[PDB]
């Protein structure tokens, strides 16, 4: 249990982000959701955290692709909570294309949100944790923060940056009661991944599941998706006392991806 | 959280092997403890696991150093417990000496108990788990499973084998509900380490706790030992449903050892 | 040798840059130097590359902190060399400070040159090399692209990001005859580092060379500095055919830095 | 380049091991080959190297599965060579089978040879190198020393042990002018390999080249085998004054295998 704890998750209005915000809350921590999305959904989910888990759940808007905006975003966050014990850096965007064909504009946005946002966020959370004697910076990289895949230059670089950045955060606060780790996800049955599945399904005349296993075969040996409840659990674990000595390292939930 | 689960931990009569069993027993699993010791203390440690967590605890002596003996051993445990859900391959010894001064005896022993016992124990338990459709193989490796240190050729080579072996186990059972991961601890305050702290405390004319920091300084930036309770905790988490898609990788509780 | 190859090198008017150019040139390839400097020395350096090794040497200026600048740069490089086989991204800058006190000017300035210049520079050379059928992109990363250190969030983030980009580049051009590898150096006795030999020298009362070892002890087990020439050799190595199938990997010359 | 050097390669009467003894010879170093085969075949090769490179070649028959035997083998190698500057541990064996079926004979035979031999061979060559003030230990592992594949437990374990063993050896001798790295090749068109490629060839009716790209496509992106000569060029480069500061690291030649 993380009762009494004050958690903050960026880009947490749906999918991965919203999943961890859910499990942290379910674990007893007060949270702060963030990210763009159809407003009613935002409020509806923010409300559903409060009621279903009996904790405080605030919503603070912020376009993390902006250095300063994100730095103040956490300050407000901490004020809304009356503290800041756990910070989950999730915000992210993607784009597929060969290097020679990769839009410089695209390259900057991914680096800015995927990499930069993590730095500015930590930079602002640390002082509050250092002064408390306890903290947890959990960055959400991916298996791509450990290995690469065709045409994902920007994303892989950024993710590899986050892993490194995770290691300096850990060393700079070693022994101060603060740890920093990165959860490196594998495939997740995400809405648009769900569209990729349908595409291969009706394009080959196969059931949805067979189509699913088809998309997972090149990378996830388990051929089974990593579930949001599992990602949430990983985060809740890192935040556990048992993870007091775990720091600067990665936690891979990729159903076997990197093992080979 | 692991109520009704049957777990077997090798080298569980004290130290880390004892805490992990205790932690799983606290999670509800029945546990089979194994290791050397004065029968009065074994019966004591076994007796409390039982009276304290209301689970069933059985002790099975076995020479993990012999391929055959370790196989009938798991076969015996499966039987005692009435099944086998979680196997923690813990046992192991250490010998420090330069490469060109390393006793072939010590070399062969380190490898037989630290590496081979893992394989024989994995192979004997795997069928039970494969027929059930669910399993948890947890190898207790080390930071030295990922990196080296002067004068530990046998231990480092053995520990790396475990990490390699753990990857093959996970890929061979991908999607079968059987996962294999390797926990990689850093400095752990063992009884032999206490004397080492004691000796350095008097040598440098400084206090005991100041000597602990001094000892961990070169390898563990957190200047804090990973507790046994913490590794049992990591074991529990690995045995959880939140880790169904965490297979063939490493859990590093090393205070930052491998971040630098 | 590499007779007739057309290698380009960023940040090469001095330091490792010039070194690699010298080795690539020493092996008979036509080079192109690029970097800040006094028109005398630079020319004196180019001109000498032309006489000293019997090859063609060109100089090109460019603000690699600018996409278009760096993209227009390798273009000029080619036009001058009449092709382009070996590309080397070396440029980079440093800045030490705890994450929470790291100026955003420095983080952005480091990410843009150390990491973003790699992207763009690569994206402009690939087409050239793609139509040719042979490529060789060498990215000078750092021990800090695999592990971290205190107060180096940006430089470590950027160098990890280059490792990833290296893999993606290699994977994206698999079997095409183009390979991309990242050389990861340990400490190089740079006049900058020399200022650290001396402070440590005057502070502890030890002779200059004993202080050289005291500086390296913390990270480089061989207590010996990596030399600019050695790196140059490694560059020529990756440019040879023996390395035809080494792609997307790291070549560490760190005296055991990453080994422990 | 290696004129006057004394190098030894185990298991080099043919294949990969031979390519290296050959390239080292071409480098100018005298060499000691070893392995299996007919007296007429061995002599034929020992013959050529010597008479086709202006180098002295000696052949020693030693069973490297026996601890005391391999320790005698290098003793005799330095005797016949007049010193020992380069030791290339290459002798290995394989066996494919699921873990619960993997033959204990097989496991012990793989470990003794693929791993234990590398230990003993290194322990006996070091003293000679320690006294010399210069030395080169080049272990030949594989991508299975970094990652894994299904059904190759003993091999992937032993290989991982080597890599770990390679690190210790380097840290134990860093600065002494001696280095130890591990060459990690990917698919090589080896005898044992070739039949897998002809197996699937007539198992789908496709000519080799296609049934082979099958075997490749799963792990090796560049769809091109690693040639023995290339591996030789690598050992030659690891023996150069360029890699004097390259030690305890792995050098991967695997068409992008570990890149993704
Ligand atoms: Ca991999
Ligand atoms: Ca390390
Ligand atoms: Cl890919
Ligand atoms: Cl050490
Ligand atoms: Cl550090
Ligand atoms: Cl496989």
Per-residue three-class SS string for A173-222 = HCCCCEEEEEEEECCCCCHHHHHHHHHHHHCCCCCHHHHHHHHHCCCCCC
Cβ atoms D87, D182 nearer than 8 A: no
In angstroms, the CA A118 to CA A51 distance is: 30
The CATH H-level superfamily of B1-260 is: NAD(P)-binding Rossmann-like Domain (3.40.50.720)
CB proximity list for C31: less than 8 A, separation 6 or greater: C7, C8, C9, C12, C21, C24, C25, C49, C55, C57, C58
Helix (H, G, I), strand (E, B) or coil at C32: strand
Tokens standing for residue D214: 């099958």
Q: What is the DSSP letter of A226?
A: P
Which of D229, D225, D249, D226 has the alpha carbon at shortest distance from D238?
A: D249
Given its phi and psi angles, is residue B163 left (phi above 0), alpha (psi -120 to 50 degrees) or beta?
alpha
State how far the Cα of C203 lies from the Cα of C215, in Å rounded to an integer. Answer: 12
**What are the percentages of helix, strand and coil residues in chain D, rounded to 5?**
50, 15, 35
Do the Cβ atoms of D73 and D123 come closer than 8 Å? no
Spell out where chain A has E strands: 6-9, 30-33, 57-59, 86-89, 135-139, 178-185, 250-253
Alpha-carbon span C6 to D104, nearest angstrom: 55
Residue A117: which of A17, A20, A185, A253 has the closest Cα?
A17
Q: Distance of alpha carbon C132 from its chain centroid, rounded? A: 24
| CA distances from residue A12 to A121, C104, D39 in whole angstroms, order as listed | 14, 25, 71
Residue with tokens 């502070």: C203
Distance separating alpha carbons of residues C218 and B260, to the nearest angstrom: 11
- The sign of the torsion formed by the CA atoms of C95, C99, C103, C107 equals positive
**C222:D167 CB<8 A:** no
* Chain B CA closest to residue D147: B164
Strand partners, A185: A253
> Which burial class, exposed, middle or buried, applies to A183 when counting CB atoms under 10 A from its CB (0-12, 13-18, 19+)?
buried
- Sign of the alpha-carbon dihedral angle for D3, D8, D13, D19: negative
How far separated are the first and last CA of chain C, in Å rounded?
A: 35
- H helices of chain B, in order, are 15-26, 39-53, 67-81, 104-111, 117-132, 153-172, 191-203, 208-216, 228-239
Pick from B100, B123, B165: CB nearest D157:
B165
Shortest CB distance from C148 goes to which of B148, B149, B260? B260
Phi, psi dihedral angles at A88 (to 5 degrees): -110, 115
Which single residue is written with the structure tokens 């090589």?
A: D188
Q: CA distances (Å), A134 to each of A162, A178, B28, C247, D99, in order?
A: 22, 5, 30, 43, 44
Instruction: Note residues around ion ligand 4 (Cβ under 5 angstroms).
Output: B 149-150
Smallest CA-to-CA distance from C114 within D108, D21, D33, A160 is with A160
Of A232, A247, A254, the CB nearest to B259: A247
Cα four-point dihedral sign A82, A84, A88, A90: positive
* C184 beta partners: C252
Q: Half-sphere exposure of residue C135, counting CA atoms within 13 Å on the CB side?
A: 31
Q: Which residues of A touch C162 (CB under 8 A)?
A: 157
Contact call for residues D64 and D91 (beta carbons, < 8 A): yes
Interchain contact, C253 vs D245, CB within 8 Å: yes
Integer Cα distance of A41 and A49 in angstroms: 12
Cα–Cα distance, A125 to D64 (Å, whole number): 58
User: Is D155 labeled as catalytic in the residue annotation?
Assistant: yes
Ligand nearest to the CA of B143: 2
Active-site residue set of B: 155
B144, B148, B167: residue with CB nearest D148: B167
Separation of alpha carbons D138 and D20, rounded Å: 11
Helix (H) or strand (E) holding C51: helix C39-53
- With CA atoms as reference, the chain D residue closest to A156 would be D260
C-alpha B44/C-alpha B38 separation (Å) is: 10
Q: Which residues contact D63 (CB under 8 A, 6 or more apart)?
A: D69, D70
Three-state SS at D2: coil
On chain D, the residues whose CB falls within 8 A of the CB of C167 are 256, 259-260
* Residues whose CB is less than 8 angstroms from the CB of residue A202 and which lie 6 or more positions away in sequence, other chains included: none
Dist. CA A181–CA A251, nearest whole Å:
7
Read off the DSSP letter of residue B100.
G
Q: Which two tokens stand for residue C77?
A: 């490089």
> What is the distance between the alpha carbons of residues D134 and A61, in angstroms, rounded to a whole number?
63
Cβ density class B10-44: b for 16+ within 10 Å, e for less: bbbbbbbbbbbbbbbbbbbbbbbbbbeeeeeebee
Q: Strand D6-9: give its sheet, edge to edge.
A: D57-59, D30-33, D6-9, D86-89, D135-140, D178-185, D250-253
- HSE-CB at A203 with a 13 A cutoff on CA atoms is 10
Give the CA radius of gyration of chain B. Answer: 18
Q: What token pair was written down for C115? A: 């990491």
Residue C173, both tokens: 């051009």
Q: Cα angle at C252 between C249 and C255, to 5 degrees?
A: 160
- Supply A78's token pair: 């901490």
Using only the alpha carbons of chain A, give its radius of gyration: 18
Q: What phi and psi values does residue C234 have, to the nearest 5 degrees?
A: -55, -40
Q: Which two tokens stand for residue D150?
A: 């299904």
C33 by DSSP, 3-state: which? Answer: strand
Q: Residue D43 and residue C96: Cα distance in Å, rounded?
A: 61
- Would you say B16 and B231 are in contact if contact means Cβ atoms under 8 Å apart? yes
For A83, how many CA atoms within 13 A lie in the half-sphere containing its CB?
17
Asked if C112 and C89 count as a contact pair (C-beta separation under 8 A), the reply is: no
Which listed ligand is nearest to A147 at the C-alpha? 1
Q: How far apart are CA A144 and CA B5, in angstroms?
A: 34
Q: What are the residues whose beta carbons fall under 8 Å from the beta carbon of D33, sequence distance 6 or more?
A: D9, D12, D13, D17, D18, D21, D42, D45, D46, D49, D57, D58, D59, D60
Contact check, Cβ <8 Å, D148/B248: yes
Angstrom CA distances, B1 to B23, B25, B90, stand at 11, 10, 22
Phi/psi zone of residue D207: left (φ > 0), alpha (ψ -120 to 50 degrees), beta? beta
Are the C-beta atoms of residues C86 and C24 closer than 8 Å to each other? yes
Mutate to test the interface with D, among C146, C237, C259, C260 (most CBs of D within 10 A): C259
Residue listed under structure tokens 């990490």: B163
Residues of chain C in contact with residue B260, where contact means CB-CB under 8 angstroms, are 147-149
**Residue of D86, D106, D72 whose CA lies nearest to D31:** D86
Q: Which of A155, A187, A225, A257 is catalytic?
A: A155
Shortest alpha-carbon distance between residue B5 and chain A (Å) = 20
Q: Is D216 within 8 Å of C226 (Cβ atoms)?
A: no
Asked if D135 and B116 touch (Cβ cutoff 8 Å), the reply is no
Sign of the Cα pseudo-torsion (A18, A20, A25, A29, in order): negative
What 3-state DSSP class applies to A135?
strand
Mutual angle of helices B153-172 and B117-132, in 10-degree steps = 20
Which residue in A70, A83, A78 sits closest to A35, CA to CA?
A70
Residue B92 CB partners (closer than 8 Å, separation 6+): B11, B110, B113, B114, B140, B158
Which residue, among B156, B165, B157, B101, has the nearest Cα to B138 in the 3D structure?
A: B165
Structural contact between residues A254 and B260, judged by C-beta atoms closer than 8 angstroms: no
- Exposed e or buried b per residue across C14-34, where buried means at least 16 C-beta atoms within 10 angstroms of its C-beta: bbbbbbbbbbbbbbebbbbbb
- How far apart are the C-alpha atoms of A156 and C241, rounded to whole Å? 28
Q: Running DSSP on this structure, what letter comes out for residue D35? A: -
Calculate Rg over the CA atoms of chain D: 18
Please state the length of chain D.
260
C-beta of residue B63 within 8 angstroms of C-beta of residue B69: yes
Contact A149 D259 (CB under 8 A): no
Pairwise CA distance, residues A45 & A33, whole Å = 9
For ligand 1, the distance from its centroid to the CA atom of residue C244, given in whole angstroms, is 20
Q: In the sheet where C250-253 sits, what is the strand order? A: C7-9, C86-89, C135-140, C178-185, C250-253
The Cα–Cα gap between B238 and B179 comes to 9
Smallest CA–CA distance, residue A53 to chain B, in Å, is 19
User: What is the rounded distance in angstroms from the CA atom of residue C165 to the CA atom of residue C183?
Assistant: 13
Contact assessment for residue C216 and residue C112, using Cβ atoms and an 8 Å cutoff: no
Question: Which tokens is D36 given?
Answer: 């299996």
Separation CA B163–CA D148 (nearest Å): 10
Phi/psi of residue B59, nearest 5 degrees: -105, 130
State the residue for tokens 């800040």. C36
Measure the CA–CA gap between D115 and D141, rounded to whole angstroms. Answer: 10
Q: Which parts of chain D fold into alpha helices (H)?
A: 15-27, 39-53, 67-81, 104-110, 117-132, 153-173, 191-199, 201-204, 208-217, 228-238
User: Helices C15-26 and C39-53, interaxial angle, to 10°?
Assistant: 20
Q: Which residues of A139-160 are buried (b: 16+ CB within 10 A; e: fewer)?
A: bbbbbbbbbbbbbbbbbbbbbb
Q: Separation of C149 CA from ligand 5 center, angstroms?
A: 4
Residue B202: DSSP 8-state: H
Q: Minimal CA–CA distance to A31: which of C123, C111, A45?
A: A45
Q: What residues pair up with D180 in beta bridges, in sequence order? A: D137
Q: Can you tell me the distance from the alpha carbon of A156 to that of C163, in angstroms, rounded to the nearest whole number?
A: 9
Residues B102, C64: Cα–Cα separation, whole Å: 53
User: Relative to the alpha carbon of D98, which ligand is closest?
Assistant: 6
Q: Taking phi first (over 0 means left), then psi (-120 to 50 degrees means alpha), and beta for anything else, what does residue B77 get? A: alpha
Residues of C in contact with A147 (CB under 8 A): 167
What is the count of residue pairs from A and B with beta carbons less than 8 Å apart? 132
Structure tokens at A158: 């950024």
Closest ligand to residue C98's CA: 5
């Amino acid at each position: 249990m993380l009762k009494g704890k004050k958690a903050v998750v960026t880009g947490s209005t749906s999918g991965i982000g919203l999943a961890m915000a859910t499990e942290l809350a379910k674990a007893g921590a007060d949270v702060v959701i963030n990210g763009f999305g159809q407003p009613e959904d935002i409020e509806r989910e923010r409300s559903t955290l409060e009621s279903k888990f009996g904790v405080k759940a605030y919503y603070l808007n912020a376009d993390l692709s902006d250095a300063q905006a994100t730095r103040d975003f956490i300050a407000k966050a901490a004020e809304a909570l009356g503290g800041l014990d756990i910070l989950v850096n999730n915000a992210g965007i993607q784009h597929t294309a060969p290097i020679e064909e990769f839009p410089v504009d695209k390259w900057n946005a991914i680096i800015a949100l995927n990499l930069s946002a993590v730095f500015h966020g930590t930079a602002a959370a640390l002082p509050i944790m250092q002064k408390q004697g306890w903290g947890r910076i959990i960055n959400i990289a991916s298996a791509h923060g450990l290995v690469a895949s065709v045409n994902k230059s920007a994303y892989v670089a950024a993710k590899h940056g986050v892993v490194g950045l995770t290691k300096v955060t850990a060393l700079e606060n070693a022994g101060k009661g603060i740890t920093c780790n990165a959860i490196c996800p594998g495939w997740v049955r995400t809405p648009l991944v769900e569209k990729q599945i349908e595409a291969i399904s009706q394009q080959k005349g196969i059931d949805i599941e067979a189509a699913a296993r088809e998309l997972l075969a090149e990378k996830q040996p388990s051929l089974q998706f990593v579930t949001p409840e599992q990602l949430g659990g990983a985060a809740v674990f890192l935040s556990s006392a048992a993870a007091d000595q775990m720091t600067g390292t990665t936690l891979s939930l990729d159903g076997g991806w990197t093992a080979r």
